[PDB]
Amino acid sequence: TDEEFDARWVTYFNKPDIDAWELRKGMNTLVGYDLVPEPKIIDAALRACRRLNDFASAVRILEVVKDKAGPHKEIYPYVIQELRPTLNELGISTPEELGLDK
Amino acid sequence: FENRVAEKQKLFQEDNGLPVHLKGGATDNILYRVTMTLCLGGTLYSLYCLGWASFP
Amino acid sequence: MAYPMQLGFQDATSPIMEELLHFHDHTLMIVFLISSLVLYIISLMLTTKLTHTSTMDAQEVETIWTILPAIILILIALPSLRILYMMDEINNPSLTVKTMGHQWYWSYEYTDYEDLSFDSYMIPTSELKPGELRLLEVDNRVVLPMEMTIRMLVSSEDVLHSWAVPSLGLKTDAIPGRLNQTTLMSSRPGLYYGQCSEICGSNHSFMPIVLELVPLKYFEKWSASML
Amino acid sequence: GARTWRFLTFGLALPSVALCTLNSWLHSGHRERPAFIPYHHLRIRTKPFSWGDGNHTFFHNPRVNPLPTGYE
Amino acid sequence: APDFHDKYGNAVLASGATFCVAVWVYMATQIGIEWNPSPVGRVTPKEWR
Amino acid sequence: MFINRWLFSTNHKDIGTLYLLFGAWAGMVGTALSLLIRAELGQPGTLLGDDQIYNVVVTAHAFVMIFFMVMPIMIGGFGNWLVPLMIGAPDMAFPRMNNMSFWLLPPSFLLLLASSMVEAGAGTGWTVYPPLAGNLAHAGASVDLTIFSLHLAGVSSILGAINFITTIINMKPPAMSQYQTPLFVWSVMITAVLLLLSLPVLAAGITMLLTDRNLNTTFFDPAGGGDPILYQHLFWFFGHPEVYILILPGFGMISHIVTYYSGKKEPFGYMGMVWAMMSIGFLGFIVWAHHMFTVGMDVDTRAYFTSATMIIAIPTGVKVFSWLATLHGGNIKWSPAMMWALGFIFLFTVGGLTGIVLANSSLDIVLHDTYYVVAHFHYVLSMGAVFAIMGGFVHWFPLFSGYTLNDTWAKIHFAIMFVGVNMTFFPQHFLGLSGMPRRYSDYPDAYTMWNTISSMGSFISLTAVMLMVFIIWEAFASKREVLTVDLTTTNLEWLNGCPPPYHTFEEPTYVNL
Amino acid sequence: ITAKPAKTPTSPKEQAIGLSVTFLSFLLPAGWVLYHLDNY
Amino acid sequence: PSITNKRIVGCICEEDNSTVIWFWLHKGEAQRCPSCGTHYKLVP
Amino acid sequence: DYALPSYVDRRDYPLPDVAHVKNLSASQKALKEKEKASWSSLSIDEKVELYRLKFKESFAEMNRSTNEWKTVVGAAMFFIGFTALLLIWEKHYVYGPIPHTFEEEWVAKQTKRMLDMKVAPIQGFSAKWDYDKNEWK
Amino acid sequence: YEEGPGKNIPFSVENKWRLLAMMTLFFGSGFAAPFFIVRHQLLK
Amino acid sequence: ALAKPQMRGLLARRLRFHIVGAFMVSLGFATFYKFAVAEKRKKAYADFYRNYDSMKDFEEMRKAGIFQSA
Ligand code: HEA
Ligand code: HEA
Ligand SMILES: CCCCC/C=C\C/C=C/C/C=C\C/C=C\CCCC(=O)O[C@H](COC(=O)CCCCCCCCCCCCCCCCC)COP(=O)(O)OCCN
Ligand SMILES: CCCCCC/C=C\CCCCCCCCCC(=O)O[C@H](COC(=O)CCCCCCCCCCCCCCC)COP(=O)(O)OC[C@@H](O)CO
Ligand SMILES: CCCCCCCCCCO[C@@H]1O[C@H](CO)[C@@H](O[C@H]2O[C@H](CO)[C@@H](O)[C@H](O)[C@H]2O)[C@H](O)[C@H]1O
Ligand SMILES: CCCCCCCCCCO[C@@H]1O[C@H](CO)[C@@H](O[C@H]2O[C@H](CO)[C@@H](O)[C@H](O)[C@H]2O)[C@H](O)[C@H]1O
Ligand SMILES: CCCCCCCCCCO[C@@H]1O[C@H](CO)[C@@H](O[C@H]2O[C@H](CO)[C@@H](O)[C@H](O)[C@H]2O)[C@H](O)[C@H]1O
Ligand SMILES: C[C@H](CCC(=O)O)[C@H]1CC[C@H]2[C@@H]3[C@H](O)C[C@@H]4C[C@H](O)CC[C@]4(C)[C@H]3C[C@H](O)[C@]12C
Ligand SMILES: C[C@H](CCC(=O)O)[C@H]1CC[C@H]2[C@@H]3[C@H](O)C[C@@H]4C[C@H](O)CC[C@]4(C)[C@H]3C[C@H](O)[C@]12C
Ligand code: CUA
Ligand SMILES: [Cu+2]
Ligand SMILES: [Mg+2]
C-alpha cells in the first residue's frame, strides 16, 4: 500500500545515525520510481541532511522533487507549502530563493 | 623407449624469452623460414598468375 | 503494363489478380497501422520529462505483445491461404500452350491439335514502330482466347528463366528438365506484358512476354491460318 | 538446471502444442464419406465380437464405419 | 558563455536551407533530366497507326 | 614488434581492430559497387554498355556487403572487442585460431576480386544458381574463384563460431549463469550456433557446383538426373539463417545502446529478449523455401512455408516492443548512437513488415524477383545492419580508441544517411508493386521516375560515407582523451578505461553466489 | 562521456582542409573513370 | 582476495537477477554495492 | 581515474558519489565548519557557495536546451545541397542521351496506343480518359 | 607493446596530416577499386 | 492553500491515456482506409464489370489496329 511504502521511506531517512552513503543511496533509489515523493518523505530526508551537516544536498533534494513532477506544475508549490515549517525551522533556502532555477 | 618428458619440460620452460614456435632450437628457425618463404613466395606467384589471367 | 508514376499493382486482368489486389489492400492496411504505431510509440516514449528507471515487471505486457500479433498473423494467413488453394483448384482447361525459355527469347508450342511453334524476340529500340513500347514489344505475340481457362506449361532449353505476366498474377520459373504448370484466364481482350524474372545472363532485361487476348472465334481463325 | 528446462517447457514445448492444436482445430470438421464397396479384405468377420450383436466394432461410429452389408 | 551554435546556428540553418533548395531546384528543372511524369492531363494523344 | 603484434596476434582487442579496419575498407568497395548499380539505373538506356559487367557488379556488391562488411564488423570486430570484456574473460578460448579466422578474409576477398578481373566475371547473382553458374553459361575461372572465396569465408566463420560458443559457455566467472550474461553476448552465441549449422550446408552445395563445373558430376544437371532446384534448397537452407546471422548481433548492440542512452541499468524483459533471439534462431532453419515460391513446389509445401515464416513476427515483435519499453521512463540522452538506434527500430520494423507481405506465397508470385524484394531487404538488412553498426561504432569508438568523436558532426552524419537511404529505397516499393524485375540493367520507360529518384538518393548516402571518414579523422586528429563514462556499473566493457590495456582481467572479477 | 581538452585541436580551417581532401579522395578517381566511360 | 590494491566486483544482488552490478573495490574501508548496499572488503 | 568514483550531473542520480570540489581552501573549510551551525545564520551567498562546492551544475543548468539543432539541420541541408552538385556533374559529363522513345511525338503516339489497348482501364490509366469526349477526365 | 590512446592501432596518429594521407589512401583505394575493375572489363 | 495534486504513477497515467488515444486513432484510420482504398477498389472493379461487353471492347481495339492476329 501507498501508506506502507511512505512509512518505510520516512523510517529510512529518520534513522538518527544515517550516514552520507545511505542518504545518497536513498534519494538516488527513490527518484527511480514513478512518483514524486510525499512531503513526509522529503521532510525526513531534509532532516537527515541537517544531521549530516549537508546544506547542499537539502537544496538538491528540493530540485529533484521539482524535476520528478515533469510538466505537472502544481506539484512543487504544493510540496513547498507542506515543507514550509521545516524549511523555516532548518534555515533551508529553496533553489528559487538561491537563484539556482536560473 | 624411456620417458624423457621431464627433459622436454625443462627445455620448453627455459627462461630464454623465445616464443613456443622457436623454443626447440635452430631447427624451429629453419622450418619457420621454409614455411614463411613458401607462403610469401607462393602468394607473390599467385598475384603474378592473377595478372596473367586478367588479360586474354 | 505499368504506366508512369505508378504506385501500386497493374490493374487486374484475371479473377486471381483481383483477389490478390483485395488481399494486398487488407495486408497493407495492417503494415501501415503497425509501422505508424511503432513510430508513434517511439515519439511518445521520447517526449516526457517524467521518469521511471527502476526495474519494470514484463510478464503482463508480454501476453498482449504475443497474443495480439498472433491474432493479426492469423487474420492475414486465413485469406492468404484461401487464395493459395483457389490458384491450385482443379480447373478444366480447354487449351494447353508450352513456353520454353532460351538465352534470350521465348518459344511457344501449341500442340493440342497441330504442331504450331514459333520464337518470340524483343523488338530492338531502333526497330520500334511509332508509339510502340521500349523493351516490351515482341515480333510474335502469344495469341490466346479470352474468358477461357488455359494451361501454360513452362520449361527452358538452357539456364533458368521465369515466365511472368503481372496483370494476370503469373510468375512460373522455367527450369530445364522440368515442366511447370500454371493456369491463365483473362477477363478481357487486349495486350498483356511481362518480363523474364530469373537472372539468365547478359540479356535478362531483354526477353519480354506479350499475350494477345482475342475472342475464341478469332483465336480459331488465327490457329486455322497457321497451317 | 530446472530454470533452463522450465524455459524450454514454456518457451518451446507448450508453444509447439498450441500451434499443433491450432493446426488440428482448423482442419477439423467431417469429410464426405466414400461410396460403400463390400471389399472382402475389409469388415472381416471370422468370429462374432464378444459384445453387442457380434457385428459392431468396439468403437463403431455409425457415420464412418460401415458394417459388412454397408452403412447403417 | 555563448557556444558555436549560439554564434552561428541561425546562419548555418538559413544558408544551408537556401543553398539546398536552390541547387536541387536547378538540378530538377534546368539540366534536361527526364522525369517522365504521367501523360494524364498533360499529353494530347496522337495517331500512331 | 609490429609484425609480431599485427600479423601474429593472439589478442582479442587487436584482432577486433583488424576486423573493424577490414570491414570499413570492404564497406567502401561495397558502396562503390552500389553507386555503379544506381548509376546504370539512374536514367533509361545503358551506361556501362555491357550487361554482363552490370551483373558482375550486382553479384560482387552483395558478397562484399554481406561477407566482407557486415559479418567481419559485427562478429569479428564488435564480437572480439566486446564479448571477452562483457564476461570478464582474459581473451577468447582459442586466441591463435581467432587470428586465422581474421587472416582468411583478405585471401577470400582477393579471390572475389580475381573472379571479377578474369574472363567476364561471375554475373550470376549472389545466389550463384546453376545452370547460369555452370561450366556452359559461365565457362572459365570466375565462378570457381567465387566458390573458393566463399569456402575461405565459410571456414573463417565456422572456426569463429566454434571460438565464440566455447568462449561464451566456458569462460564466464564461475558464479555467472547464462542468464546473467549481457544481451550482446547472447546475440553473438546465437549467431555463432546459426553459422556452425548453416555454413557447412552452403559448403556442401557450392562444392557440388564446383564438381559439376570441373569433375563431370551432375548434381544440378538434368542430363545426368540432377536438379537445379536441389542447389536452391542447399543454398537457401544456409541463406535464411544467414539473414538472421546478419541482424542478430545488431539486435544485441541495439539492446545495449537503447538501455545505455535511456539511462537504464537493464533492458526491459531480459528473459523475453533471450527467448526471442533463440526463437528467431530456431524458426530461421524451417522457413528457407519462401525463397522458392515460384519454382513449382506443391501447394501444401507453400502453405507450410507461408505459415512458418509468419511465426517469426511474434518473437521479433517482443524485441521491438521491449526496446520501446526500455525507452519508457528513460532520462533520454539524445546522443548520435541513440539516433542510430531509434532509426534502426523504425526502419527495421518497416522492412520486417514487407517481409510479412512477401511470406504470403500467393502475393509473392507477383512480388518475387521484383524491386519489392530489393526494397524489403535494403530496409531490414541494409539499413538495419548498417544503422546498428553505426550506432555501435559511435557508442564504442571511445572505448576502442581512447578518443571522443564530435557529437554535432556525428548527428549531421546520421541526418544525411537517414535522408539518403529512404530516398534510395522507399520508391523501390512502387517499382516492385508495378512489376519492375530485379537484376535488370535497364527498364521499360514507365519506371523512369522512381529509378531516377532512387539513384539521386544513392548519392546522398555517398556524401554521408565521405563525411563519416572525415569525422573519424577529426577524432584522431584532435586527440580528446576520454576520462569517465556513466553507467559503468551495468557496462563492464568500460571499467578498464579507454582504451583498455592490452591484457585485461589478468586478475578475474570477483562474483559470489 | 567526459574528456580532456584536445591535445592537438583541429581549427575550423584544419577541418575544411581535412573534409576537402577526404571528399576529393573519393570523388576524383571515380570521376576520372566515369568521365572516360566513352573512351572505354 | 586480490594480488593488488583493487579488484572488480560483480554483485548479483538477488538470486536470479539477470543484471550484474560492477565496480572497483579498493583497499581500505569496506565499500557497498551501489544497488543493494552489500559490504565488500579487499584482502590483499 | 576510470577505477575511482566520479562526479556526474544526471537528473536521475541527483546525489553523486563525490563532491564537485575535492580540495578546499581555508575559507571554504571555515564555511564547511560554519555549515555545522544553524543554516539560518548562513547568508544567501554562503548557501550558494556550499551548493557550488558539492555540485557543478544546478538542475536548471544541466537541463538547458541548446541551439545545436540549427547547426545539425543546416549542415545536413548544406551536404544534401552539395550532393545535387555531384548529380549535376554526373548529368553533364557521364550521362549521354536518353532513348528516342522519350521524345514528345513518340510519347503522344505511345499514349494513344496505350488508350487504344485500354491499359489499366479500371483505375490506373485508361480509366482517367473520357472515350466519349476524347479528352482526359 | 605500447599501450594507451593512439598506441593500440596499426597506424600512426602522431601527425594529423600524415594520418589524413594514410586514411585517404586507405578508404580511397577501396572506393576506387570497383571503378577500375569496371574500366578493366570494358577495355577487354 | 493548495490541495494535494496526484503525485504517484504520473508516467503510467500518461502511457494509459496515449495508448487508448492510439487505439481510437487506429480505428479511425481503419475506417478512412476501408472507404478511401479497399471499398473504393471493390466498387471500381464491380462497377467496371457490371455492364462490361468484352466483344465490344475487342471490336474497339481491333478497329484501332492493336492486334497482330485480327
Ligand atoms: C537482416 C536481414 C533480414 C531479415 C532480418 C529478414 C527478415 C524477414 N524476411 Fe527477408 N530477406 C532478406 C533479409 C532479411 N529478411 C534478404 C537479403 C532477402 C533476399 C535474398 C535474395 O533474394 O537476394 C530476403 C528475402 C525474403 C523473402 C523472399 C522474397 C522473394 O524473393 O520473393 C521472404 C519471404 O517470406 C522474406 C520474409 C522475411 C520475414 C517474414 C522476416 C521476418 O524475420 C521479419 C519480422 C519482423 C517484423 C514483422 C517487424 C517487427 C514486428 C512487430 C512490430 C510485431 C507485430 C507485427 C506483425 C503482427 C506482423 N524475406
Ligand atoms: C548488407 C547488405 C547490403 C548493404 C549494406 C547494401 C547497400 C546498398 N545496396 Fe544493395 N544489395 C544487397 C545487399 C546490401 N546492399 C544484396 C544481397 C543484393 C542482391 C544481389 C543480387 O541480386 O544477387 C543487393 C542488391 C542491390 C540492388 C539491386 C540490383 C539489381 O537488382 O539489379 C540495388 C539497387 O539500387 C542496391 C543498392 C544498394 C545501395 C545504393 C546501397 C548503399 O549505398 C546504401 C547505403 C549504405 C552504405 C553506404 C554502407 C555504409 C557502411 C560502411 C561504409 C561501413 C562502415 C564501417 C564502420 C563504421 C566500421 N543493392
Ligand atoms: C485410447 C487407447 C487405449 C486402449 C484402451 C482400449 C481398449 C482396451 C484395452 C487395450 C489394450 C491393447 C491392445 C489389445 C488389443 C486390441 C485393442 C486395440 C486398441 C483398440 O481399442 O482397438 C479398438 C478395437 O478394440 C477391440 O477390439 C477391443 C478389444 C478389447 C479386449 C482386448 C483383449 C485383450 C488381449 C489380451 C492381452 C494380452 C497381453 C499379453 C501380455 C504379454 C505376456 C507375456 C479400435 O476400435 P474399432 O471400433 O475397431 O475401430 C475404430 C472405428 N471408429
Ligand atoms: C578448397 C580447400 C579450401 C580449404 C582451405 C582450408 C582452410 C584453412 C587452412 C587450414 C590450416 C589449418 C592449420 C591448423 C589449425 C589448428 C587449429 C586448432 O587446433 O585450434 C585449437 C582450437 O580449435 C579446436 O580445438 C577445434 C577446432 C579444430 C579445427 C581444425 C582445423 C579445421 C580446418 C578446416 C575445417 C572445415 C570444416 C568442415 C565443415 C564444413 C587450438 O586453438 P589455439 O587458439 O591454437 O590454441 C589454444 C591453446 O590453448 C592450445 O594449447
Ligand atoms: C557546412 C558546415 C556547417 C558547420 C558544421 C560544424 C559542425 C561542428 C560544430 C561544432 O560542434 C561542437 O564542437 C565543439 C568543439 O570540438 C564540441 O565541444 C568539444 O570540444 C572541446 C574539447 O577539446 C570541449 O570544449 C567540449 O567539452 C567538447 O565537447 C561540441 O561538443 C560540439 O557541439
Ligand atoms: C559515383 C561517385 C562519383 C561522383 C561524381 C564525382 C564528382 C566529380 C569529381 C571530379 O572528377 C573529375 O572531373 C573532371 C571534370 O570536371 C575530370 O577532368 C576531365 O575533364 C576535364 C575538363 O573537360 C579535363 O580538363 C581533364 O583532363 C579530364 O580528365 C577529371 O578526370 C575527374 O577526376
Ligand atoms: C531526417 C532525420 C533528421 C534527424 C535530424 C537530427 C536533429 C538533431 C538535432 C540536435 O539538436 C539538439 O538536440 C539536442 C540533443 O541531441 C537537444 O538537447 C536538449 O533537448 C533534450 C530533451 O529533448 C535534452 O535531453 C537535452 O539535455 C537538451 O539540451 C538540443 O536542445 C538540440 O538543439
Ligand atoms: C617392446 C615394445 C615396448 C614399448 C615401450 O614400452 O617402450 C612394444 C610395446 C607394445 C608394442 C607394439 C604393440 O605390440 C602392437 C604392434 C605389434 C606388432 O607385431 C609390431 C608393432 C607394434 C606397434 C608393437 C611395437 C613395439 O614392439 C611395442 C611398442
Ligand atoms: C519461462 C521463461 C523464463 C522465466 C525465468 O526463468 O525468468 C520465460 C522467458 C520468456 C517467456 C515467454 C515470453 O514472455 C513470450 C510469451 C509471453 C506469454 O505471455 C506467455 C508465453 C511466452 C512464450 C513466455 C513463456 C515463458 O514465460 C518465458 C519463455
Ligand atoms: Cu531469361 Cu532472365
Ligand atoms: Cu529467408
Ligand atoms: Mg527467382
Ligand code: NA
Ligand atoms: Na541502364
Ligand SMILES: [Zn+2]
Ligand atoms: Zn548488489
